[PDB]
Coordinates of C-alpha atoms in Angstrom, one line a residue:
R999 CA 139.3 90.2 -16.3
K1000 CA 136.2 88.3 -17.6
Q1001 CA 135.9 85.6 -14.7
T1002 CA 133.1 83.6 -13.2
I1003 CA 131.1 84.3 -10.0
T1004 CA 128.4 82.5 -7.8
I1005 CA 125.2 84.7 -7.3
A1006 CA 122.3 82.3 -6.5
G1007 CA 124.5 79.0 -6.0
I1008 CA 124.6 78.9 -9.8
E1009 CA 128.0 79.8 -11.3
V1010 CA 127.8 82.6 -13.8
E1011 CA 130.4 84.5 -16.2
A1012 CA 130.8 88.1 -15.4
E1013 CA 132.8 91.2 -16.2
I1014 CA 134.5 92.4 -13.0
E1015 CA 136.6 95.5 -12.0
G1016 CA 138.8 96.4 -8.9
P1017 CA 137.7 99.6 -7.2
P1018 CA 139.7 102.9 -8.2
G1019 CA 142.0 104.1 -5.5
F1020 CA 141.5 107.3 -3.6
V1021 CA 144.1 109.7 -5.3
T1022 CA 145.5 111.8 -2.4
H1023 CA 147.5 115.1 -3.6
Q1024 CA 150.9 116.0 -2.2
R1025 CA 149.2 119.5 -1.5
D1026 CA 146.7 117.4 0.7
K1027 CA 149.6 116.4 2.9
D1028 CA 151.7 119.6 3.0
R1029 CA 148.6 121.6 4.1
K1030 CA 148.0 119.0 6.9
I1031 CA 144.4 118.6 5.3
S1032 CA 144.5 114.9 4.3
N1033 CA 143.9 112.0 6.9
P1034 CA 146.5 112.3 9.5
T1035 CA 147.8 108.8 9.8
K1036 CA 146.2 106.5 7.1
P1037 CA 144.4 107.2 3.8
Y1038 CA 140.7 106.0 4.2
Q1039 CA 139.0 104.2 1.4
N1040 CA 135.2 103.6 0.9
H1041 CA 134.9 101.0 -1.8
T1042 CA 136.7 98.1 -0.2
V1043 CA 135.4 95.5 -2.7
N1044 CA 135.1 94.9 -6.6
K1045 CA 132.4 96.0 -9.1
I1046 CA 130.2 93.7 -11.2
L1047 CA 129.9 95.6 -14.8
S1048 CA 127.8 92.8 -16.6
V1049 CA 126.5 89.2 -15.8
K1050 CA 125.8 86.6 -18.5
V1051 CA 122.0 85.9 -17.6
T1052 CA 120.8 82.4 -18.8
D1053 CA 117.6 80.3 -18.6
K1054 CA 119.1 78.2 -15.7
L1055 CA 120.0 81.3 -13.6
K1056 CA 116.9 83.5 -14.1
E1057 CA 114.7 80.3 -13.0
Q1058 CA 116.7 80.0 -10.0
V1059 CA 116.2 83.7 -9.2
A1060 CA 112.4 83.1 -9.7
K1061 CA 112.3 80.1 -7.4
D1062 CA 114.2 82.1 -4.7
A1063 CA 111.6 85.0 -4.9
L1064 CA 108.8 82.4 -4.2
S1065 CA 110.4 80.4 -1.5
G1066 CA 112.5 83.0 0.5
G1067 CA 115.7 81.2 -0.7
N1068 CA 118.2 80.1 2.2
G1069 CA 119.5 83.7 3.0
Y1070 CA 118.2 86.6 5.2
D1071 CA 114.9 86.9 3.5
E1072 CA 114.0 83.3 4.0
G1073 CA 110.5 83.3 5.4
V1074 CA 109.4 86.4 3.4
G1075 CA 109.1 84.9 -0.1
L1076 CA 105.9 85.2 -2.1
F1077 CA 104.6 81.7 -1.1
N1078 CA 106.4 81.4 2.1
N1079 CA 105.7 84.5 4.5
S1080 CA 103.9 85.1 7.8
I1081 CA 100.5 86.2 6.3
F1082 CA 100.6 83.5 3.4
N1083 CA 101.4 80.8 6.0
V1084 CA 98.8 81.8 8.6
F1085 CA 96.1 81.6 5.6
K1086 CA 97.3 78.3 4.4
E1087 CA 97.2 76.8 8.0
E1088 CA 93.5 77.7 8.1
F1089 CA 92.5 76.2 4.8
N1090 CA 94.4 73.1 6.1
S1091 CA 91.7 72.9 9.0
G1092 CA 88.7 70.6 8.7
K1093 CA 86.1 73.5 8.7
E1094 CA 83.6 74.6 5.9
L1095 CA 84.5 77.3 3.4
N1096 CA 83.0 80.2 5.3
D1097 CA 86.0 80.0 7.8
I1098 CA 87.1 82.6 5.2
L1099 CA 85.3 84.9 7.9
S1100 CA 88.2 84.0 10.4
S1101 CA 90.9 84.9 7.9
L1102 CA 89.3 88.4 7.6
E1103 CA 89.0 88.7 11.3
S1104 CA 92.9 88.0 11.4
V1105 CA 93.2 91.3 9.2
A1106 CA 90.8 93.8 11.2
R1107 CA 91.9 92.8 14.8
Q1108 CA 95.6 93.7 15.1
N1109 CA 97.3 92.7 11.8
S1110 CA 95.9 95.6 9.6
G1111 CA 99.3 96.8 8.6
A1112 CA 100.8 93.2 7.8
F1113 CA 97.9 92.5 5.5
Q1114 CA 97.5 95.5 3.2
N1115 CA 101.3 95.4 2.8
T1116 CA 101.7 91.7 1.8
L1117 CA 98.4 92.0 0.0
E1118 CA 100.0 94.4 -2.6
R1119 CA 102.6 91.7 -3.8
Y1120 CA 99.8 89.7 -5.3
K1121 CA 97.3 92.6 -6.0
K1122 CA 98.5 93.5 -9.6
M1123 CA 97.6 89.8 -10.6
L1124 CA 94.8 89.3 -8.0
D1125 CA 92.6 92.0 -9.7
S1126 CA 91.2 89.8 -12.3
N1127 CA 92.1 91.8 -15.5
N1128 CA 91.0 88.6 -17.6
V1129 CA 94.1 86.7 -16.5
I1130 CA 93.8 85.5 -12.8
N1131 CA 92.2 82.2 -13.7
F1132 CA 95.2 80.7 -15.4
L1133 CA 97.2 81.0 -12.0
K1134 CA 94.7 79.5 -9.6
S1135 CA 95.4 75.8 -9.1
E1136 CA 92.4 73.2 -9.1
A1137 CA 90.3 75.9 -7.8
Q1138 CA 89.7 76.9 -11.4
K1139 CA 86.7 74.6 -11.3
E1140 CA 85.2 76.4 -8.2
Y1141 CA 86.1 80.0 -9.0
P1142 CA 83.7 80.9 -11.9
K1143 CA 80.7 79.9 -9.7
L1144 CA 82.1 80.9 -6.2
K1145 CA 82.9 84.5 -7.5
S1146 CA 79.4 85.4 -6.9
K1147 CA 79.1 84.0 -3.3
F1148 CA 81.5 86.3 -1.4
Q1149 CA 80.4 89.0 1.2
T1150 CA 83.3 91.4 1.0
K1151 CA 86.1 92.0 -1.4
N1152 CA 88.9 91.1 1.0
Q1153 CA 87.0 87.7 1.8
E1154 CA 87.2 87.1 -2.1
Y1155 CA 90.9 88.0 -2.9
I1156 CA 92.2 86.2 0.2
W1157 CA 90.7 83.0 -1.5
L1158 CA 92.9 83.9 -4.5
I1159 CA 96.2 84.0 -2.6
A1160 CA 95.2 80.9 -0.7
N1161 CA 94.7 78.9 -3.7
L1162 CA 97.5 80.3 -6.2
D1163 CA 99.8 77.5 -7.7
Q1164 CA 103.6 78.3 -7.1
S1165 CA 104.4 76.1 -10.3
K1166 CA 102.9 78.9 -12.6
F1167 CA 105.5 81.6 -11.7
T1168 CA 108.7 80.4 -13.5
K1169 CA 108.9 83.8 -15.4
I1170 CA 110.8 87.1 -14.7
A1171 CA 109.6 90.5 -15.6
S1172 CA 111.4 92.8 -18.2
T1173 CA 112.8 95.3 -15.6
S1174 CA 113.9 92.8 -13.0
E1175 CA 115.8 90.9 -15.9
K1176 CA 118.1 94.1 -16.7
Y1177 CA 119.0 94.4 -12.9
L1178 CA 120.2 90.6 -13.0
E1179 CA 122.4 91.5 -16.0
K1180 CA 123.9 94.2 -13.7
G1181 CA 124.4 91.4 -11.3
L1182 CA 121.7 92.3 -8.7
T1183 CA 119.2 89.5 -7.7
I1184 CA 115.5 90.1 -6.9
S1185 CA 115.0 90.4 -3.0
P1186 CA 112.7 87.8 -1.9
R1187 CA 111.2 90.6 0.5
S1188 CA 110.7 92.9 -2.4
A1189 CA 109.3 90.6 -5.0
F1190 CA 105.9 90.9 -6.4
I1191 CA 103.8 89.3 -9.3
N1192 CA 102.7 91.8 -11.9
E1193 CA 99.6 91.5 -14.4
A1194 CA 101.2 89.2 -16.9
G1195 CA 101.8 86.2 -14.6
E1196 CA 105.5 87.1 -14.0
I1197 CA 107.8 88.0 -11.0
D1198 CA 109.1 91.6 -10.6
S1199 CA 110.4 93.7 -7.7
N1200 CA 110.9 97.0 -5.8
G1201 CA 114.4 95.8 -4.7
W1202 CA 117.6 94.1 -5.7
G1203 CA 120.7 92.9 -3.9
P1204 CA 124.3 91.9 -4.8
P1205 CA 126.1 88.7 -3.5
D1206 CA 127.7 89.6 -0.2
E1207 CA 131.2 89.7 -1.4
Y1208 CA 129.9 92.6 -3.7
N1209 CA 127.9 94.6 -1.0
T1210 CA 129.7 98.1 -0.7
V1211 CA 127.9 99.1 2.7
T1212 CA 128.5 96.0 5.0
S1213 CA 132.0 95.5 3.7
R1214 CA 132.8 99.2 4.7
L1215 CA 131.2 98.8 8.0
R1216 CA 132.9 95.4 8.8
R1217 CA 136.2 96.9 7.9
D1218 CA 135.6 99.9 10.0
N1219 CA 134.1 98.2 13.2
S1220 CA 137.1 95.5 13.0
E1221 CA 140.0 97.9 12.5
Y1222 CA 139.1 101.7 12.9
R1223 CA 137.5 101.3 16.3
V1224 CA 139.3 100.8 19.5
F1225 CA 137.4 98.2 21.3
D1226 CA 136.9 96.4 17.9
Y1227 CA 134.6 93.7 16.9
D1228 CA 134.3 91.3 14.0
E1229 CA 130.6 92.1 12.9
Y1230 CA 129.4 94.9 10.7
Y1231 CA 126.3 95.9 12.9
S1232 CA 126.1 99.4 14.5
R1233 CA 125.7 99.4 18.4
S1234 CA 122.4 99.7 20.2
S1235 CA 121.4 102.8 22.1
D1236 CA 121.7 100.8 25.4
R1237 CA 125.3 99.6 24.3
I1238 CA 126.2 103.2 23.5
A1239 CA 124.8 104.6 26.8
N1240 CA 126.6 102.0 29.1
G1241 CA 129.8 101.9 27.0
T1242 CA 129.8 98.2 26.0
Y1243 CA 131.0 96.4 22.8
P1244 CA 130.5 92.9 21.2
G1245 CA 133.3 90.5 22.4
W1246 CA 134.3 93.0 25.4
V1247 CA 133.2 92.8 29.1
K1248 CA 133.1 95.7 31.4
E1249 CA 133.9 95.8 35.2
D1250 CA 133.4 98.8 37.5
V1251 CA 136.7 99.5 39.3
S1252 CA 135.8 102.9 40.8
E1253 CA 136.4 102.0 44.5
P1254 CA 140.4 101.8 44.7
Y1255 CA 140.4 105.3 42.5
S1256 CA 137.7 106.7 44.7
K1257 CA 139.9 106.0 47.7
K1258 CA 143.0 107.2 46.2
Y1259 CA 141.4 110.6 44.7
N1260 CA 138.8 111.1 47.5
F1261 CA 135.4 111.3 45.7
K1262 CA 132.0 109.5 46.6
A1263 CA 130.0 107.3 44.5
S1264 CA 127.4 110.3 44.2
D1265 CA 130.2 112.7 43.0
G1266 CA 129.6 111.6 39.1
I1267 CA 133.4 110.5 38.5
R1268 CA 133.6 106.7 37.6
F1269 CA 136.3 104.2 36.4
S1270 CA 135.6 101.1 34.5
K1271 CA 137.8 98.5 33.0
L1272 CA 137.2 96.8 29.5
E1273 CA 138.8 93.4 28.7
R1274 CA 138.4 91.4 25.4
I1275 CA 136.7 88.0 26.0
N1276 CA 139.0 86.0 23.8
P1277 CA 142.3 87.8 24.2
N1278 CA 144.6 88.4 21.2
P1279 CA 148.3 87.6 21.7
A1280 CA 149.4 88.1 18.1
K1281 CA 150.0 91.9 18.3
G1282 CA 150.4 93.8 21.6
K1283 CA 148.1 96.7 20.6
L1284 CA 145.3 96.4 23.0
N1285 CA 143.4 93.7 25.1
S1286 CA 142.3 95.8 28.2
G1287 CA 141.5 99.4 28.8
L1288 CA 140.8 101.6 31.7
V1289 CA 138.0 104.0 31.0
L1290 CA 137.1 107.4 32.8
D1291 CA 133.4 108.4 33.0
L1292 CA 132.7 112.0 33.9
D1293 CA 128.9 113.1 34.3
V1294 CA 129.5 116.9 33.9
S1295 CA 125.7 117.5 34.8
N1296 CA 127.0 116.9 38.3
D1297 CA 128.9 120.0 39.8
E1298 CA 131.5 118.1 41.7
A1299 CA 132.5 116.1 38.6
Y1300 CA 132.6 119.3 36.5
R1301 CA 134.5 121.3 39.3
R1302 CA 137.1 118.3 39.6
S1303 CA 137.2 117.1 36.0
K1304 CA 140.3 119.3 35.0
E1305 CA 142.0 118.5 38.4
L1306 CA 141.3 114.7 38.0
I1307 CA 142.4 114.6 34.4
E1308 CA 145.9 116.1 35.5
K1309 CA 146.5 114.1 38.7
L1310 CA 145.8 110.8 36.7
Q1311 CA 148.4 112.0 34.1
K1312 CA 151.3 113.0 36.5
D1313 CA 150.7 109.9 38.4
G1314 CA 151.1 108.0 35.0
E1315 CA 147.9 105.9 35.0
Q1316 CA 146.9 105.5 31.3
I1317 CA 143.2 106.0 30.1
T1318 CA 142.1 104.2 26.8
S1319 CA 138.7 106.1 26.9
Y1320 CA 137.4 109.4 28.3
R1321 CA 133.7 109.6 28.4
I1322 CA 132.4 113.1 28.9
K1323 CA 128.5 112.9 29.7
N1324 CA 125.7 115.5 29.5
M1325 CA 127.8 118.4 28.2
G1326 CA 125.6 121.5 28.3
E1327 CA 122.5 119.7 29.9
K1328 CA 122.2 121.9 33.1
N1329 CA 123.7 125.0 31.6
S1330 CA 123.9 125.6 27.9
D1331 CA 126.9 128.2 28.0
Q1332 CA 129.1 125.8 30.1
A1333 CA 132.8 125.9 28.8
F1334 CA 134.8 123.0 28.1
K1335 CA 138.2 124.3 26.2
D1336 CA 140.0 124.2 29.6
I1337 CA 139.1 120.6 30.3
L1338 CA 139.4 119.2 26.7
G1339 CA 142.7 121.2 26.5
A1340 CA 143.9 119.4 29.7
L1341 CA 143.5 115.8 28.3
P1342 CA 146.7 114.1 26.9
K1343 CA 148.2 115.2 23.5
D1344 CA 147.7 111.6 22.5
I1345 CA 144.4 109.9 23.1
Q1346 CA 142.9 106.4 22.3
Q1347 CA 139.3 107.3 22.5
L1348 CA 137.1 110.4 23.4
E1349 CA 133.2 110.0 23.8
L1350 CA 131.5 113.3 24.0
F1351 CA 127.8 113.3 24.8
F1352 CA 126.2 116.7 24.0
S1353 CA 122.9 118.0 25.1
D1354 CA 120.6 119.1 22.1
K1355 CA 119.1 121.9 24.3
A1356 CA 122.5 123.4 24.4
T1357 CA 123.8 122.2 20.9
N1358 CA 127.0 123.9 22.2
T1359 CA 129.8 122.2 20.3
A1360 CA 132.1 125.4 20.4
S1361 CA 135.1 123.5 22.1
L1362 CA 138.3 123.0 19.8
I1363 CA 140.6 120.1 20.0
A1364 CA 143.1 120.7 17.0
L1365 CA 146.6 121.6 18.4
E1366 CA 147.1 117.9 19.5
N1367 CA 149.0 114.8 18.1
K1368 CA 146.4 112.2 18.0
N1369 CA 142.9 110.7 18.5
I1370 CA 143.9 107.1 17.6
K1371 CA 141.1 106.2 15.2
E1372 CA 138.3 107.4 17.6
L1373 CA 136.1 110.6 18.2
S1374 CA 132.5 109.9 19.0
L1375 CA 130.2 112.9 18.7
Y1376 CA 126.9 111.7 20.5
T1377 CA 123.7 113.0 21.8
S1378 CA 120.7 111.5 23.8
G1379 CA 118.2 114.0 21.9
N1380 CA 117.3 115.1 18.4
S1381 CA 120.6 114.5 16.2
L1382 CA 119.5 115.7 12.9
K1383 CA 118.5 119.4 14.1
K1384 CA 119.8 122.1 11.6
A1385 CA 121.6 123.8 14.4
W1386 CA 124.3 121.2 14.9
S1387 CA 127.8 122.4 13.7
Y1388 CA 131.5 121.4 13.7
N1389 CA 134.5 123.5 13.2
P1390 CA 136.2 121.4 10.4
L1391 CA 139.8 122.6 11.7
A1392 CA 138.9 121.0 15.1
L1393 CA 139.3 117.4 13.6
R1394 CA 142.7 117.9 12.1
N1395 CA 144.7 115.1 13.7
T1396 CA 141.6 112.8 14.5
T1397 CA 142.1 109.6 12.4
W1398 CA 138.3 108.4 12.3
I1399 CA 135.2 110.3 13.6
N1400 CA 132.4 107.6 14.5
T1401 CA 129.7 107.5 11.8
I1402 CA 128.5 104.1 12.6
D1403 CA 126.2 103.8 15.8
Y1404 CA 123.5 105.9 13.9
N1405 CA 120.2 105.1 15.7
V1406 CA 117.5 107.3 14.3
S1407 CA 114.0 106.0 13.3
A1408 CA 110.2 106.8 13.3
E1409 CA 109.4 103.4 15.0
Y1410 CA 110.8 104.3 18.5
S1411 CA 108.5 105.5 21.2
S1412 CA 108.3 109.3 21.8
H1413 CA 109.4 110.1 25.4
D1414 CA 112.5 107.9 25.9
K1415 CA 116.2 108.6 25.5
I1416 CA 117.9 107.2 22.4
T1417 CA 121.6 107.8 21.9
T1418 CA 123.1 108.2 18.3
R1419 CA 126.0 109.8 16.5
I1420 CA 125.1 113.6 15.3
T1421 CA 124.3 114.4 11.7
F1422 CA 126.1 117.5 10.7
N1423 CA 125.2 119.6 7.6
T1424 CA 126.9 122.7 8.9
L1425 CA 130.4 123.9 8.9
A1426 CA 131.1 126.9 11.6
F1427 CA 134.4 128.6 11.7
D1428 CA 135.6 130.2 15.0
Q1429 CA 137.0 133.8 15.7
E1430 CA 140.6 132.7 15.9
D1431 CA 140.4 131.3 12.3
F1432 CA 140.5 135.1 10.8
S1433 CA 143.2 136.7 12.5
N1434 CA 144.9 139.0 10.0
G1435 CA 142.3 139.6 7.3
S1436 CA 143.6 136.3 5.7
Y1437 CA 141.2 133.6 4.2
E1438 CA 143.8 130.9 4.4
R1439 CA 142.7 128.8 7.4
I1440 CA 139.1 128.9 6.2
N1441 CA 140.2 127.7 2.6
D1442 CA 142.2 124.8 4.2
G1443 CA 139.3 123.8 6.7
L1444 CA 136.6 124.1 3.8
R1445 CA 138.6 121.9 1.3
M1446 CA 139.1 119.3 4.1
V1447 CA 135.5 118.4 4.1
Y1448 CA 134.6 119.2 0.5
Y1449 CA 137.7 117.3 -1.1
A1450 CA 140.6 116.5 0.9
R1451 CA 138.9 114.0 3.3
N1452 CA 135.6 113.8 1.4
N1453 CA 135.7 110.0 0.7
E1454 CA 135.2 109.3 4.4
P1455 CA 131.5 109.1 5.7
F1456 CA 131.7 111.8 8.3
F1457 CA 132.7 114.6 5.9
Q1458 CA 129.7 113.6 3.6
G1459 CA 127.0 115.1 5.8
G1460 CA 123.5 113.5 6.3
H1461 CA 123.0 111.9 2.8
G1462 CA 126.3 109.8 2.5
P1463 CA 128.0 108.5 -0.7
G1464 CA 127.6 108.6 -4.5
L1465 CA 128.4 105.8 -6.8
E1466 CA 132.2 105.9 -6.5
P1467 CA 133.1 107.9 -3.2
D1468 CA 137.1 107.6 -3.8
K1469 CA 137.1 108.7 -7.4
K1470 CA 134.5 111.1 -8.3
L1471 CA 134.4 113.3 -5.0
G1472 CA 131.9 115.7 -6.7
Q1473 CA 129.2 113.1 -6.9
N1474 CA 129.1 112.7 -3.1
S1475 CA 127.3 114.5 -0.3
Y1476 CA 128.9 117.4 1.8
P1477 CA 127.8 119.6 4.5
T1478 CA 125.8 122.4 2.4
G1479 CA 125.5 125.1 5.4
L1480 CA 128.2 127.7 6.3
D1481 CA 128.0 129.5 9.7
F1482 CA 130.2 132.7 10.3
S1483 CA 128.4 133.8 13.4
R1484 CA 131.4 133.5 15.6
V1485 CA 133.8 135.4 13.0
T1486 CA 132.6 138.9 13.0
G1487 CA 134.7 140.3 10.0
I1488 CA 133.2 138.0 7.1
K1489 CA 130.3 139.7 5.2
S1490 CA 130.1 137.7 2.0
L1491 CA 131.5 134.6 0.1
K1492 CA 134.5 136.9 -0.8
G1493 CA 137.8 135.0 -0.8
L1494 CA 136.1 131.4 -0.4
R1495 CA 137.1 128.7 -2.9
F1496 CA 134.3 125.7 -3.5
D1497 CA 136.4 123.7 -6.0
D1498 CA 139.4 121.3 -5.7
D1499 CA 142.1 123.6 -7.7
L1500 CA 141.3 121.0 -10.4
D1501 CA 138.2 121.3 -12.4
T1502 CA 137.6 118.7 -15.3
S1503 CA 137.4 115.7 -12.8
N1504 CA 134.9 117.1 -10.1
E1505 CA 131.7 119.0 -9.5
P1506 CA 132.2 122.5 -7.7
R1507 CA 130.2 122.5 -4.4
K1508 CA 127.1 124.9 -4.0
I1509 CA 125.8 126.0 -0.4
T1510 CA 122.1 126.0 0.5
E1511 CA 122.4 128.1 3.6
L1512 CA 124.7 131.0 4.9
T1513 CA 124.8 132.6 8.5
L1514 CA 126.6 135.8 8.9
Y1515 CA 127.4 137.9 12.2
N1516 CA 125.4 141.1 12.6
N1517 CA 125.5 143.5 15.4
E1518 CA 123.0 146.3 14.4
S1519 CA 119.6 146.7 12.7
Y1520 CA 121.3 147.6 9.5
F1521 CA 123.5 145.1 7.5
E1522 CA 126.5 147.3 6.9
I1523 CA 128.4 146.5 3.7
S1524 CA 131.2 147.9 1.8
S1525 CA 131.3 148.2 -2.2
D1526 CA 132.9 144.5 -2.3
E1527 CA 129.5 143.3 -3.7
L1528 CA 131.0 143.7 -7.2
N1529 CA 133.3 140.6 -6.0
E1530 CA 131.3 138.6 -3.4
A1531 CA 131.6 135.1 -4.9
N1532 CA 128.2 134.9 -6.6
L1533 CA 126.9 131.5 -8.2
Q1534 CA 128.4 129.5 -5.2
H1535 CA 125.2 130.2 -3.1
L1536 CA 122.7 128.3 -5.2
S1537 CA 121.1 125.5 -3.2
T1538 CA 121.9 122.0 -4.5
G1539 CA 120.7 123.1 -8.1
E1540 CA 119.2 125.7 -10.5
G1541 CA 115.5 124.5 -11.0
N1542 CA 114.4 123.9 -7.5
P1543 CA 111.1 125.4 -6.2
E1544 CA 112.8 126.3 -3.0
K1545 CA 115.6 128.9 -2.9
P1546 CA 118.7 129.0 -0.6
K1547 CA 119.0 131.0 2.6
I1548 CA 120.8 133.9 4.3
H1549 CA 120.6 134.4 8.0
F1550 CA 122.0 136.9 10.6
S1551 CA 123.1 136.3 14.1
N1552 CA 120.5 139.0 15.5
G1553 CA 117.4 138.8 13.2
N1554 CA 116.8 142.7 13.8
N1555 CA 117.7 143.4 10.2
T1556 CA 114.4 145.1 9.5
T1557 CA 116.4 148.3 8.7
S1558 CA 118.2 148.4 5.4
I1559 CA 121.3 146.9 3.8
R1560 CA 123.7 150.0 4.5
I1561 CA 125.9 150.4 1.5
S1562 CA 129.1 152.4 2.4
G1563 CA 132.0 153.6 0.2
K1564 CA 132.0 155.9 -2.9
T1565 CA 132.6 153.0 -5.7
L1566 CA 129.7 152.2 -8.1
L1567 CA 128.3 148.7 -8.4
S1568 CA 129.0 146.5 -11.6
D1569 CA 126.6 143.9 -13.1
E1570 CA 127.5 141.3 -10.6
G1571 CA 127.4 144.0 -7.8
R1572 CA 123.5 144.3 -8.8
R1573 CA 123.2 140.5 -8.9
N1574 CA 124.9 140.0 -5.5
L1575 CA 122.7 142.9 -3.9
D1576 CA 119.4 141.0 -5.0
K1577 CA 120.6 137.9 -3.1
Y1578 CA 120.7 139.5 0.4
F1579 CA 117.1 140.7 -0.1
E1580 CA 115.7 137.4 -1.8
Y1581 CA 117.4 134.8 0.4
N1582 CA 116.8 136.6 3.9
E1583 CA 113.2 136.6 5.2
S1584 CA 113.5 139.8 7.4
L1585 CA 115.1 141.8 4.5
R1586 CA 112.7 140.3 1.7
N1587 CA 109.6 141.9 3.3
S1588 CA 110.5 145.5 2.5
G1589 CA 113.6 145.7 0.3
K1590 CA 115.1 148.7 2.0
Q1591 CA 118.5 150.0 1.0
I1592 CA 120.6 152.8 2.7
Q1593 CA 123.4 154.9 0.9
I1594 CA 125.5 156.9 3.3
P1595 CA 126.1 160.5 2.2
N1596 CA 128.7 160.4 -0.6
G1597 CA 128.4 159.3 -4.3
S1598 CA 125.5 159.8 -6.7
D1599 CA 122.5 157.7 -5.6
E1600 CA 123.2 155.3 -8.5
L1601 CA 120.6 153.1 -6.9
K1602 CA 117.0 154.6 -7.0
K1603 CA 115.2 153.2 -3.8
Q1604 CA 117.3 154.0 -0.8
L1605 CA 117.0 156.2 2.5
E1606 CA 119.9 158.6 3.4
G1607 CA 121.4 156.5 6.1
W1608 CA 120.1 158.1 9.2
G1609 CA 121.1 155.4 12.1
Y1610 CA 118.3 156.2 14.4
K1611 CA 116.1 153.8 16.4

């Protein structure tokens, strides 16, 4: 312990710790609910607990925020950036002082979002406040007269930034000094000057050996991916659509196969070869791979896909990637269980491109040996729509689901196709997961996501990790929706567990949303409401303005909750009945109850259970 590390060129003494290992339990192996081939770990690199800050270090961290340093934020520092450099070059021209007019024209024409974005980084100093004159170079003689002689506020305070002296700014602000004691240096892009003539920021970064995000993405792209690459970057939408990878080259080879298996180039079946540009002799695992492309929006490729997938198997030609494109694009009820079930028991890669006008992920691939560290769940539509679900049991013997290749931003054009991995906040169980009145297969599938594989990015849903994903599984995100629309016997959270069997080491999960099957205008329920699991449907937390949701597969539930059986409600029976009226809109509107003709009318608000509409 108690070593030295470098953080700004400067060598510094620091307290350093190794990342806690993911503790797998032997019950996570014997239920086949842990990762099937290799235990994943999220924190690949060490932690900095404290850094001995010194005058020599914090003035180096000051000079980097002014210059940009020599890293990625070079050319966006306080006195070396695109707006500051365009203003200094005009002051360096031979013209008279009123060329300030042309600098203002360079903020009205096209650049109105680069100024009024860089301006803020000076503005807290730039508004005079009885301080600005001490940080104003030789222009301190001109300022007190010339202040009266400006035609617009911007034309004035442009003349402050273009005449500030960099040599005055060797002081760090009180908050940004404490992040430096945690070992995170001011980002030169996030640096601003506050009121007191001192450098502060809205952003701080570790040294790259201590970055948790890029070291994880590097490790995943270099060893979990088939068609691996040495970088940490996600693939572009054009790379994802064309099926191309850094350090690999693609050739179309469809002609021999089209001649063997009798298809036209228009029939929507393709074969392509990938080969690594520098081959790797040192381990025989993969240097080239045959890839099968099936555009199932075509009707020849859909008709023949199962036949072709089997003719390639009995001929013994080996496929490294199957790519199934436009699933559900033409017809949203289009089935795939017969096609996905015809694929080999042992597969290197599977890319599925689902249509978001279908959002039909109902096909299930559990009873296999292996997806060899690749399943890609992709769309060319809206990938963060609340109607995106997976069955958690459908991934049981998939080693890694692709969670990189995330390509969503506000800055894309509308009306072009962009491809990305799906964000899932829903777990959706299917009818074959509830055969004998047993709740066993669901509690396995539920804990798979919520604890047994939770340290992996895919099982975290759309919000990602906490501070320590491998240790404190409770502090991490999870899919907060449950859908039971396919599994008609479930009426409640009865028989469902939301904690790890343990308790003192982890948070218990809370769901925000619950979809239930219903078939009639009445929600029929037994007197199990005494023992529906109660506090487990409570959003993320207790104080929130927005309450959690209940939904039904029909929406016709504007007739009552029909309460059946003779047994009286308890105190938690009352509390559970409230939630179905509160959390479901089309029940909330009138609060209607039905008691079928037995018992006392222990409740005082209901109809006599007619069943007529």
